[PDB]
Design a protein around this motif. Structure first.
Motif, short mmCIF file in Angstrom:
data_model
loop_
_atom_site.label_atom_id
_atom_site.label_comp_id
_atom_site.label_asym_id
_atom_site.label_seq_id
_atom_site.Cartn_x
_atom_site.Cartn_y
_atom_site.Cartn_z
N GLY A 137 5.87 23.31 -9.84
CA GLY A 137 5.68 22.66 -8.27
C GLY A 137 5.92 21.63 -8.77
N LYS A 138 4.83 20.96 -9.55
CA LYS A 138 4.66 18.97 -9.68
C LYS A 138 3.99 18.98 -8.01
CE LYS A 138 6.55 15.03 -11.33
NZ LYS A 138 7.38 14.37 -12.02
N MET A 139 3.10 19.10 -7.67
CA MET A 139 2.81 19.38 -6.09
C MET A 139 1.90 17.02 -5.96
SD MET A 139 2.98 22.33 -5.53
CE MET A 139 3.10 23.73 -6.15
N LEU A 140 1.03 17.23 -7.10
CA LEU A 140 0.63 15.79 -7.26
C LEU A 140 1.44 14.87 -7.31
CD1 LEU A 140 -2.37 15.92 -10.33
CD2 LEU A 140 -3.08 16.50 -7.46
N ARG A 141 0.32 14.13 -6.40
CA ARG A 141 1.57 12.59 -5.44
C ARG A 141 0.08 11.27 -6.38
NH1 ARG A 141 0.48 14.83 0.21
NH2 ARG A 141 -2.01 15.02 -1.02
N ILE A 142 0.80 9.75 -6.28
CA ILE A 142 0.43 9.22 -6.78
C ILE A 142 -0.58 8.86 -6.59
CG2 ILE A 142 1.53 6.95 -5.69
CD1 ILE A 142 1.41 6.96 -9.33
N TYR A 143 -1.38 9.15 -5.25
CA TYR A 143 -2.49 8.17 -4.80
C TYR A 143 -3.74 9.36 -4.99
CZ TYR A 143 0.52 10.83 -0.49
OH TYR A 143 1.33 11.38 -0.38
N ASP A 144 -2.60 10.63 -5.17
CA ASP A 144 -3.71 11.49 -6.11
C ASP A 144 -4.05 11.60 -6.94
OD1 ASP A 144 -3.51 13.86 -3.23
OD2 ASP A 144 -1.51 13.92 -3.98
N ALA A 145 -4.01 11.06 -8.17
CA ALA A 145 -4.01 10.73 -9.50
C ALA A 145 -4.73 10.16 -9.75
CB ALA A 145 -2.67 11.49 -10.03
N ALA A 146 -4.01 8.53 -9.39
CA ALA A 146 -3.51 7.23 -9.93
C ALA A 146 -4.93 6.95 -10.28
CB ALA A 146 -3.04 5.70 -9.23
N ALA A 147 -6.15 6.85 -9.54
CA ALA A 147 -7.73 6.23 -9.66
C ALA A 147 -8.38 6.64 -10.77
CB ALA A 147 -8.18 5.84 -8.60
N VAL A 157 0.83 -1.26 0.35
CA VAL A 157 -0.13 -0.20 -0.11
C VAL A 157 0.83 0.91 -0.02
CG1 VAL A 157 -1.85 1.22 1.23
CG2 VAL A 157 -2.20 -1.33 1.37
N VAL A 158 0.48 1.99 -0.44
CA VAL A 158 1.14 3.76 -0.81
C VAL A 158 0.31 4.50 -0.94
CG1 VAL A 158 2.35 5.12 -2.61
CG2 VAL A 158 2.31 2.58 -3.31
N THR A 159 0.08 4.89 0.49
CA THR A 159 -1.00 5.88 0.84
C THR A 159 -0.48 6.91 1.85
OG1 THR A 159 -2.81 6.15 2.52
CG2 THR A 159 -1.16 4.70 3.72
N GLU A 160 -1.00 8.12 1.79
CA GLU A 160 -0.49 9.27 1.88
C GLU A 160 -0.13 9.57 3.33
OE1 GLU A 160 -2.30 14.38 2.26
OE2 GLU A 160 -3.36 12.88 1.36
N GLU A 161 -0.70 9.58 4.58
CA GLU A 161 -0.34 9.21 5.48
C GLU A 161 0.87 8.45 6.67
OE1 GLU A 161 -3.65 11.51 5.02
OE2 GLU A 161 -2.19 12.74 5.27
N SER A 162 0.63 6.93 6.62
CA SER A 162 1.48 6.18 6.69
C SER A 162 2.81 5.55 5.93
CB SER A 162 0.46 4.50 7.06
OG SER A 162 -0.41 5.34 8.16
N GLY A 163 2.49 5.95 4.65
CA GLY A 163 3.40 5.56 3.72
C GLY A 163 3.38 4.05 2.87
N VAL A 164 4.27 3.90 2.84
CA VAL A 164 4.13 2.59 2.24
C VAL A 164 4.28 0.80 3.17
CG1 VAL A 164 5.47 1.13 0.30
CG2 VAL A 164 5.49 3.36 0.29
N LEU A 165 3.33 -0.29 3.47
CA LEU A 165 3.02 -0.87 4.26
C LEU A 165 2.54 -2.52 3.08
CD1 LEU A 165 0.57 1.26 6.33
CD2 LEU A 165 2.84 0.41 6.78
N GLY A 166 2.89 -3.38 3.79
CA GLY A 166 2.84 -4.20 3.26
C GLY A 166 4.09 -5.43 2.30
N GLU A 167 3.98 -6.10 2.05
CA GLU A 167 5.07 -6.94 0.31
C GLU A 167 4.39 -7.36 -0.53
OE1 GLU A 167 7.94 -8.43 3.93
OE2 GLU A 167 9.04 -7.87 2.34
N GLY A 168 3.20 -7.30 -0.61
CA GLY A 168 2.58 -7.74 -1.77
C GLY A 168 2.94 -7.50 -3.03
N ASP A 169 2.29 -8.74 -4.50
CA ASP A 169 3.51 -7.98 -5.74
C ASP A 169 2.04 -7.11 -6.59
OD1 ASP A 169 4.85 -9.72 -4.81
OD2 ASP A 169 3.89 -10.97 -6.91
N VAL A 170 0.36 -7.07 -5.82
CA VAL A 170 -0.25 -5.50 -6.18
C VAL A 170 -0.14 -4.44 -5.34
CG1 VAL A 170 -3.06 -5.30 -5.97
CG2 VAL A 170 -2.12 -7.35 -6.42
N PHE A 171 0.00 -3.39 -5.88
CA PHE A 171 0.74 -2.17 -5.67
C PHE A 171 -1.43 -1.44 -5.34
CE2 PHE A 171 4.40 -3.51 -5.62
CZ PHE A 171 5.18 -2.81 -4.51
#
Ligand SMILES: [Mg+2]
Ligand SMILES: [Mg+2]
Ligand SMILES: [Mg+2]
Ligand SMILES: [Mg+2]
Lengths: 252, 252
Positions: free
Chosen positions: A193-203, A64-78
């Motif tokens: 500034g290029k502000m948008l992060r991956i969890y902002d845009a991806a979906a 999981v890549v998430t804004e507050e806690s960051g990167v968690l877990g080790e699965g192949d699906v992100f």
């Protein structure tokens, strides 16, 4: 995991996050309670949403890549997760804020197989899979506008523009969906500034593309290589295929 | 007519307009059914809203000034009515659209005694009378922001701007209320075209002023003399006392 699971996991997450936020008074929502791993503040709203979403997601074989806690877990699906996009609006009782999830078979956006953005104030559900792009269970496609004299969402206007109207609602994951259903003729985030992060845009990007939209970085390059990590940043240019090259020129 | 009536009448109108708009599907809302006396086209959504509004209003000793049907009645009390502000958002299903009313004892804004703006998507009810300004029955007031690094609603950015956040939602009558309750530190409509009409702004200004905000025209002059007629146009600069003059300086 397939697109069907993701749609089911997302529904479950959307429900709990809608509860948790609804049950939290404004004055509470706005408190700063910590630093996010992204380097922005975590508000009491974000934390309460993320905790609800993480409870459900960690049970899956994911990273999981998430804004507050960051990167968690080790699965192949992100999974790129904005537990709460439009946190500012949510603290003010402005009805445009969402939880947003993009599932990919790889740490790169080009292996996305599911996008999900759910407006936590109204219950409008946007998502996308193989079958296409949907709003509240009905297929959504982008507009056919050809003129620059269109309806625009743009971050930020800083000069004269030939647009019929400009709008800025303060929830990128939801505004990408305003483009995906044809509500707006384009979505521009050209902030140098290029502000948008991956969890902002991806979906949002995934939904927009499945809804037929042409979506590229500030200069027309595929977003396929954008990574599911905390370091990643984005400019977005998005429109129907006819109008897209026209905008690319305009913002030069 | 007193402020108590105006509340009762506005609430009676809000209900009817909430229903009428609610039972009309998007695809239907966006049809152009006529030309408004204001010189903009009347969407089917505008018509149904206004028709419901006027049904109730013309039973009163009023002169109504409304976007679609223009000036009606001969009452000594004038009502500035936007039967639907944010018509665009309403045709797309974005939960930011309102019915808006400002009752005045004469055809000038300075004689206003009631302001009312109701979001037809969320049911958020803003209003103001002698007792003050209210959102959903609870009193509100503007922010105390001092620095230009503030949250701004601005029509339209075409420059560098020292704001922390810029937003544009597409419902001036609602956005003036986002200012009035301190969600945003200021409401700026600086469009040289002078695009705002009396029924877009009047309720919003009254509510914002009662909530503590300084609301002026482009150069600092009182809005007191704005007329309740179709001709009349407005730029707005709204902010708390400390911030207001800084903003007047900022733009020119
Ligand atoms: Mg943060
Ligand atoms: Mg945040
Ligand atoms: Mg009209
Ligand atoms: Mg109109």
């Amino acid at each position: 995991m397939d697109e069907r699971d993701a749609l089911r996991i997302s529904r479950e997450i959307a429900g709990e996050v809608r509860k948790a936020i609804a049950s939290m008074p404004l004055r509470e929502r706005v408190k700063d309670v910590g630093m996010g791993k992204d380097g922005t503040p975590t508000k009491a709203a974000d934390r309460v949403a993320e905790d609800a979403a993480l409870e459900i997601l960690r049970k899956e074989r994911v990273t999981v890549v998430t804004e507050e806690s960051g990167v968690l877990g080790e699965g192949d699906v992100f999974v790129a997760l904005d537990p709460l996009d439009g946190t500012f609006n949510a603290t003010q009782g402005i009805p445009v804020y969402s939880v947003s999830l993009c599932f990919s078979y790889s740490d790169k956006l080009k292996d996305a197989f599911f996008g999900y953005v759910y407006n936590l104030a109204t219950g409008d559900e946007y998502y996308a899979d193989s079958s296409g792009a949907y709003r509240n269970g009905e297929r959504i496609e982008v507009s056919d506008a050809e003129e620059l004299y269109c309806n625009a969402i743009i971050y930020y206007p800083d000069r004269k523009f030939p647009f019929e109207r400009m709008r800025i609602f303060g929830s990128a994951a939801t505004e990408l969906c305003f483009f995906a259903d044809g509500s707006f003729d384009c979505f521009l985030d050209i902030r140098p500034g290029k502000m948008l992060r991956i969890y902002d845009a991806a979906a949002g990007v995934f939904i927009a593309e499945k809804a037929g939209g042409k979506v590229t970085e500030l200069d027309g390059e595929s977003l396929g290589n954008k990574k599911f990590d905390m370091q990643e940043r984005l400019n977005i240019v998005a429109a129907n295929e006819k109008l897209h090259p026209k905008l690319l020129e305009l913002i030069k």
